[PDB]
Design a protein around this ligand. Structure first.
Ligand SMILES: [Zn+2]
Lengths: 21, 30
């Protein structure tokens, strides 16, 4: 998911915003 | 903003900056 994807590939801050509460 | 390559604790730092006081969930694969 997000953890893996940011490390194996690349991710954007907008993607990370999906993890905020 | 730019695309980032974030591993380990560096991802948790990014989440902290993005979410701030909303807080977040850090859910890695098992
Ligand atoms: Zn490091």
């Amino acid at each position: 998911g997000i953890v893996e994807q940011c490390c194996t590939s690349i991710c954007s801050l907008y993607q990370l915003e999906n993890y905020c509460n | 903003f730019v695309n980032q390559h974030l591993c380990g604790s560096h991802l948790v730092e990014a989440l902290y900056l993005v979410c701030g006081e909303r807080g977040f969930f850090y859910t890695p694969k098992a």
